[PDB]
Amino acid sequence: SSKWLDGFRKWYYNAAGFNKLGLMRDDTLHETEDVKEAIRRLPEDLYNDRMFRIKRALDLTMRHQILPKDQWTKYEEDKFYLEPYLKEVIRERKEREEWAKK
Amino acid sequence: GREFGNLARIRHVISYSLSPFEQRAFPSYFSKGIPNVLRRTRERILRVAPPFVVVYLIYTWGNQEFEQSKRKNP
Amino acid sequence: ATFAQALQSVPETQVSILDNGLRVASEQSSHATCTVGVWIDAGSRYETEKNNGAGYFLEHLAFKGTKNRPGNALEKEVESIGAHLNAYSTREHTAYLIKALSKDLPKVVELLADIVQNSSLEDSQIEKERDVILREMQENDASMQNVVFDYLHATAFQGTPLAQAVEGPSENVRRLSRTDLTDYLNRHYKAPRMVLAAAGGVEHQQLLDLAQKHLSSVSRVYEEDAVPGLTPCRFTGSEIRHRDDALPLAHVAIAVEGPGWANPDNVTLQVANAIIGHYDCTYGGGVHLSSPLASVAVANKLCQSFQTFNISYSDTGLLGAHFVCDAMSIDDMVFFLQGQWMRLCTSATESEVTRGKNILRNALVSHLDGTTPVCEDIGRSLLTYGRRIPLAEWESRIQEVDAQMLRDICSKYFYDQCPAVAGYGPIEQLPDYNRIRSGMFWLRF
Amino acid sequence: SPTIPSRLYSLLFRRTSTFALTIAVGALFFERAFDQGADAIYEHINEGKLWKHIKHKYEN
Amino acid sequence: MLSRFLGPRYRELARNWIPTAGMWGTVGAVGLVWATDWRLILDWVPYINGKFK
Amino acid sequence: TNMRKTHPLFKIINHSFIDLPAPSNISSWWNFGSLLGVCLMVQIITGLFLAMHYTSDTMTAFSSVTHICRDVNYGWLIRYMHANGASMFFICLFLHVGRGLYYGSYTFMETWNIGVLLLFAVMATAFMGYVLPWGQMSFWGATVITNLLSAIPYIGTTLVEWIWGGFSVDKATLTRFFAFHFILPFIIAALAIVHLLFLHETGSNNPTGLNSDADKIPFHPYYTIKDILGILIMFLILMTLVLFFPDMLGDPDNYMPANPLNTPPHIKPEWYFLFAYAILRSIPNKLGGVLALILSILILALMPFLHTSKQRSLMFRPITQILYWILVANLLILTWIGGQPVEHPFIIIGQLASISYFSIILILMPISGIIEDKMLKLYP
Numbered sequence A: 001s002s003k004w005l006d007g008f009r010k011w012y013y014n015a016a017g018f019n020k021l022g023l024m025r026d027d028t029l030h031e032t033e034d035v036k037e038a039i040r041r042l043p044e045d046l047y048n049d050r051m052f053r054i055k056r057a058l059d060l061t062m063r064h065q066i067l068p069k070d071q072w073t074k075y076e077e078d079k080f081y082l083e084p085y086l087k088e089v090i091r092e093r094k095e096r097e098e099w100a101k102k
Numbered sequence B: 001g002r003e004f005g006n007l008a009r010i011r012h013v014i015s016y017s018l019s020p021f022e023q024r025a026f027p028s029y030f031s032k033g034i035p036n037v038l039r040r041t042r043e044r045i046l047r048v049a050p051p052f053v054v055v056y057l058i059y060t061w062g063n064q065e066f067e068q069s070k071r072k073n074p
Numbered sequence C: 001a002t003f004a005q006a007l008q009s010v011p012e013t014q015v016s017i018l019d020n021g022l023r024v025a026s027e028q029s030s031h032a033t034c035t036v037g038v039w040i041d042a043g044s045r046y047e048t049e050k051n052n053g054a055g056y057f058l059e060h061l062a063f064k065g066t067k068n069r070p071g072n073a074l075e076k077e078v079e080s081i082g083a084h085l086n087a088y089s090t091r092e093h094t095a096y097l098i099k100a101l102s103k104d105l106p107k108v109v110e111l112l113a114d115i116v117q118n119s120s121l122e123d124s125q126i127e128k129e130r131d132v133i134l135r136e137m138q139e140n141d142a143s144m145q146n147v148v149f150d151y152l153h154a155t156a157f158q159g160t161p162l163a164q165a166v167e168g169p170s171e172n173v174r175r176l177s178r179t180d181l182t183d184y185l186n187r188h189y190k191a192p193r194m195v196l197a198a199a200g201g202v203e204h205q206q207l208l209d210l211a212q213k214h215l216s217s218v219s220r221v222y223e224e225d226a227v228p229g230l231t232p233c234r235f236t237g238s239e240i241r242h243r244d245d246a247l248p249l250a251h252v253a254i255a256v257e258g259p260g261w262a263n264p265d266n267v268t269l270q271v272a273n274a275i276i277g278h279y280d281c282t283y284g285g286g287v288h289l290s291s292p293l294a295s296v297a298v299a300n301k302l303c304q305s306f307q308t309f310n311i312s313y314s315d316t317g318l319l320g321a322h323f324v325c326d327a328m329s330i331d332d333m334v335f336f337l338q339g340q341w342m343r344l345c346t347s348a349t350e351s352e353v354t355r356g357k358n359i360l361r362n363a364l365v366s367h368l369d370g371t372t373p374v375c376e377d378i379g380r381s382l383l384t385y386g387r388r389i390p391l392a393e394w395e396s397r398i399q400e401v402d403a404q405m406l407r408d409i410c411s412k413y414f415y416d417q418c419p420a421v422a423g424y425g426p427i428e429q430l431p432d433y434n435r436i437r438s439g440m441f442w443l444r445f
Numbered sequence D: 001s002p003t004i005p006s007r008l009y010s011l012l013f014r015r016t017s018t019f020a021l022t023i024a025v026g027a028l029f030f031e032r033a034f035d036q037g038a039d040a041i042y043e044h045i046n047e048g049k050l051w052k053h054i055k056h057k058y059e060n
Numbered sequence E: 001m002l003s004r005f006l007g008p009r010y011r012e013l014a015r016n017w018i019p020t021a022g023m024w025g026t027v028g029a030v031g032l033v034w035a036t037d038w039r040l041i042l043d044w045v046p047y048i049n050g051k052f053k
Numbered sequence F: 001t002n003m004r005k006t007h008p009l010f011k012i013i014n015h016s017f018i019d020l021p022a023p024s025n026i027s028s029w030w031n032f033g034s035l036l037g038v039c040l041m042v043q044i045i046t047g048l049f050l051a052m053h054y055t056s057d058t059m060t061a062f063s064s065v066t067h068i069c070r071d072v073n074y075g076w077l078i079r080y081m082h083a084n085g086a087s088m089f090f091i092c093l094f095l096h097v098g099r100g101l102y103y104g105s106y107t108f109m110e111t112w113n114i115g116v117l118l119l120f121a122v123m124a125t126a127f128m129g130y131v132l133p134w135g136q137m138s139f140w141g142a143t144v145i146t147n148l149l150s151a152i153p154y155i156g157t158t159l160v161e162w163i164w165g166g167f168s169v170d171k172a173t174l175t176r177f178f179a180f181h182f183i184l185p186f187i188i189a190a191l192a193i194v195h196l197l198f199l200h201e202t203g204s205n206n207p208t209g210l211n212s213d214a215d216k217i218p219f220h221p222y223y224t225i226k227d228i229l230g231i232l233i234m235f236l237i238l239m240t241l242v243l244f245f246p247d248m249l250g251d252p253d254n255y256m257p258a259n260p261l262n263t264p265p266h267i268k269p270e271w272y273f274l275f276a277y278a279i280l281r282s283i284p285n286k287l288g289g290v291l292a293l294i295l296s297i298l299i300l301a302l303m304p305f306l307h308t309s310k311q312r313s314l315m316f317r318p319i320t321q322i323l324y325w326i327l328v329a330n331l332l333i334l335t336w337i338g339g340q341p342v343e344h345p346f347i348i349i350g351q352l353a354s355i356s357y358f359s360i361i362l363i364l365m366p367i368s369g370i371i372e373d374k375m376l377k378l379y380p
């Protein structure tokens, strides 16, 4: 039942509500030390786009509004830009931890 | 220490504001409030209300079961 | 080809004693160049504050002419054969060495023989290198590391002949004369305090024949019939601070008393220093240095540099650290350094012990690369230990060091001790002696 | 054979945990002995005046 | 104690800190016995028990 | 040159209330903690004007309270304002805690720990203050709470005798409870200063849970006038509660003098204790009930270690939103059960509610966060 899981994933993505604020999935991650290091390694255009998206979301939440439905972040164009940087940061931190174990 | 001027690095963002003496305090209040109140209610009522509904049901059941317990058993 | 038989394949140092008491030692190698030196057990520790700059002024005068080669003529026959002539003096040693080819071995033995025996001194030369040593001391006042280490030796060995520097104060070099230098030569340049070391393409038989031909007469009789001894020096927990806020950087050295030359525990202490290591601002590593002190210093931008040291003297020594940094970091750096010392007294695990053992192995073997450090090792080893310690013996002594005896030796020498602190520069945030003294023990341990 | 403060430091005062242990042990020994000595002195000042000196003619 | 303390260096560190922790627990035990003045421990002593405390 | 950034007394006020950077999108729930401070201040002021006529002796405690309500000019206003202000203080406190739970504000760990210490202090202050008027339910609730606190083996009886100052609740207990009820709100105020300091070290939290550094505004005049409006609204509910219905939240049986010979047929504390009392009735063990009470307060302090998600707030976590509202519903159920007689079917309902409470906070919420991470293609 792959398409049932996929359509349920689309439903959960629409029901989470951050697509109505223009946000991506990687903007909603909590900025811990690994996530902050992932933002620090970003290229500057992606960093500026992310900062504008957070500012727009905070401005929309201030007025208790949402974007119009055509401006919502669609599921197919939601790019997981922070995944390789976060993956590298987790790999390096686990390597440091396993070196500190021995 | 964490005052203005060094909170975050923001590039190429333009912000526009008016004086409060040029704009209304309540600009189109209910025409933009009742649709937004109904919209917020629509997004949150299915996650808020049914726990309180089943609390009301358990409360009424407990009250009627207490009254039936106090009643006679011929 | 493992490490054990690689260290066993090092050639044996050949040591013989002449009839006057002169030691003659050689290290035969495959090189076409040789290094021959004379080591005399005579330094600033062997001076009685009336000839406090005798060794420095004598090694200034040593290459200025002899009774057989007056003037610069000997210079010609050390510069027409390509040989390089060098000399130095520490607080307890003196060395005169020539590096040359293998073909010029009898000539360099002859020059080393008559330099230390028939050095001609004349009053015009006395005043010439008097003003030269005055200008040298004025130059050496601007090197802050030398000033700090002289301060540390002054405050850690107070009232003893180990406090006085090699150069001595300016009043002595303005008042030393010919007669005191002649007395110093007659008292200190003797065969039982003299080692002729050779390294490189030198056979022991030819070196022994030349040493018997040239260095047979050294006047080893005690002429004054007074025994020159070596009393132990009293370590003093103290501090000296030289506040001068115009200097751009501050140098601070903190050290405790060392065990000595002949203590085996020095080897363990070397491993301890290899755990702490060193750091300079031009290091290419960065955050991922193995030493926690260097890693926290580059993460917090604390110090310009730090380095550990274990200076050794007869029964005594200085075991500690030296860091240069800006003023605003000083106390923080001290705290971290103290924590590292207490970590080695309490929580030394086997991983950093193995890392320090490997670092000490590599440094102590690769230091002896070339004829000059091998010759220096031979001369200093025959003067200090009484013998040349083989490198496999150093390997066997490093191998027995584990974490338990390392924290035992560290608790013996670092824990709850009274250190000596020398500071120079903007040292206002460098704390009192009481906070540093309280940093030598943990309340949690 | 060193002095007794030397071995006292090297066995009792070198480590902070056993330092606090001997502070506690000496504290309980000192409170017992000091209460003994203080009641002995206060008893010695005041013969025939305290109640414990006269609770045999009336206790029976 | 999820995964990063599952290592031999941490076990040998804990084994190094067993006697200091045991001595500090002994300090806390003797201090608690002396401060709360517990009868069930101070009845088996040669000298303190004369006051019954 | 200006005294706002230079004068050391005005510097702290400037960096705490005037020029403090605050998120622009925090909703009205962020009013509540500030409201709590005002409530505390109001209580202290009214408490001071209650301390000027209260006599802390058992023969003249209820009589002094009646003298306050009958002869002192507007003494009824002061006393009923104090009682209803305590109730509104716990309303603000419960909503402050629930907002901290919903928007992931427990990641500020030191602020959360100072908060739960403040919660323990204000609960003790309220309990002792309710002992103070020396009514029937005051004395009997004090006796019940202390003699169930006696359930620790070998330590409990000596501890409850030393708390009592005797064999039961008597004049010594009333005097020491007056002294302790006086002394606790100043310690609460100092802990609130430490609370605000620990918050201002790291900044505050926005409802979206994102980083609010991209859009921050000065505290003045925005949240100044927002807090003024919140204070006016809180005063509207408080003055409605004191001036129209002074007894929906009180107990009539506290208007009788304290009788040790007569026990009431039903003994219950106020509503902000009642749910905990329900947990205290859930387990039929004395020591187990006491530990159930203590863990029922302390698992809020435990919850910073129960975060298994990579998203902070619950705004984008709808399953944990549903489970959180089920938890608040269970808290309302426990509050209702706590004021009920110990009789069927309230026993099995209270046991089910306590089991659901500890299961939701301990077990189900991290599992919900883990599966939400899995559905967002984050967890492996």
Ligand code: HEM
Pocket: F040, F043, F044, F046, F047, F048, F050, F051, F054, F065, F079, F082, F083, F086, F089, F122, F123, F125, F126, F129, F130, F131, F132, F133, F181, F182, F183, F184, F185, F186
């Ligand atoms: C230091 C400041 C305070 C003083 C001097 C004080 C003083 C008093 C006094 C004298 C009474 C008894 C009079 C009465 O019947 O109301 C009382 C009752 C009470 N106080 Fe306080 N109080 C203070 C702070 C608080 C705080 C912060 C709370 C909230 C936790 C609180 C909660 C109560 C409650 C619930 C009652 C019982 C109300 C009643 O039964 O009438 N008090 N207080």
Ligand code: HEM
Pocket: F029, F030, F031, F032, F033, F034, F036, F037, F040, F093, F096, F097, F100, F105, F106, F108, F111, F112, F114, F115, F116, F118, F119, F122, F188, F192, F195, F196, F199, F203, F204, F205, F206, F300
């Ligand atoms: C004694 C009653 C309390 C007072 C007076 C108090 C006071 C405050 C104040 C003034 C603030 C800053 C304003 C705000 O953010 O709303 C605040 C924030 C906060 N408090 Fe409390 N508080 C109290 C109880 C608690 C408790 C019991 C907790 C723990 C559950 C708590 C946790 C927090 C947290 C986490 C924040 C910061 C969240 C944020 O700013 O977004 N507080 N409190």
